């Protein structure tokens, strides 16, 4: 059996892992593909845990579209969108 909280936690970790790897240039074009897939599929951008990477994620063309700059803050929403996937929102 699989528990909602742990699987959401795991998917979020996998995303962070892909994000960190995608941000450093090399054969890590697989990580860049995964990140692009997650961003496009979940209509998100960035990690709420690994927030420091955001500028590097933007500069690596991983978030071409989608407004993340709300009010006067850029909010990283992938961890939320992952939560919404497993919640049904």
């Amino acid at each position: 059996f699989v528990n909602k909280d742990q699987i959401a936690k795991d998917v979020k970790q996998f995303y962070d892992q892909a994000l960190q790897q995608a941000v450093v240039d090399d054969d890590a074009n697989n990580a860049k593909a995964v990140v692009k897939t997650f961003h496009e599929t979940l209509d998100c951008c960035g990690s709420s845990t690994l927030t420091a990477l955001t500028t590097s994620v933007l500069k690596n063309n991983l978030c071409p579209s989608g407004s993340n700059i709300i009010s006067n803050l850029f909010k990283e929403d992938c961890h939320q969108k992952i939560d919404d996937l497993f919640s049904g929102k």
Partner: single-chain antibody
Amino acid sequence: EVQLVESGGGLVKPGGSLKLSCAASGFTFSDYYMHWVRQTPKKRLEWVATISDGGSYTYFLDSVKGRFTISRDNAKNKLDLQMSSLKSEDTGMYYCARDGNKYSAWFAYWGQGTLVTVSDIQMTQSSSSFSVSLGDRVTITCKASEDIYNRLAWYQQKPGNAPRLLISGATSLETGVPSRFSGSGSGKDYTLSITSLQTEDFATYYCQQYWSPPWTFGGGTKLEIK
């Protein structure tokens, strides 16, 4: 309950080498990115290195790149900075710091420091010092060279001691930080306001941006009594 103890100093020859080590305790070491921030003799704060939670990812200050190396032992709860090809610019107190979250580049906890003696977003703090009396009110200003999207921290530092985090995300006070401290601002302009100045409040105040690396600090604003 968080503790960081740094060993490895001090006196070294130009071109020389040193091996700084930090001994973490009181939190889950494996869950945080760890950093090295140095304070120059002219009391200027400067971030130098970052190691990822797992250890596989490494970030460095351009001036230390290729001379400095980072490592960590999650089993031994320890972090190391291997310094080589040392220059005069490298002199200062070396603080070991735990990240506020996994990797947001603000420093929630710092160690006492190890002295190392050897022989870009501009963060502008208008006033180097302010002469204010007890019970007074102050507003310390911090200006950014570009929009830093409220990704700003404020540190208090009394002499002898290391910097202590007051505010993160421009406005959010840390736990155990009194109501008299407040942070406001947006884009490039930020402020730290202290009302009803008490005695413990006289110290040097720094702002730091954590939007784009290198994580630059302000010059500081020292509050002196009169």
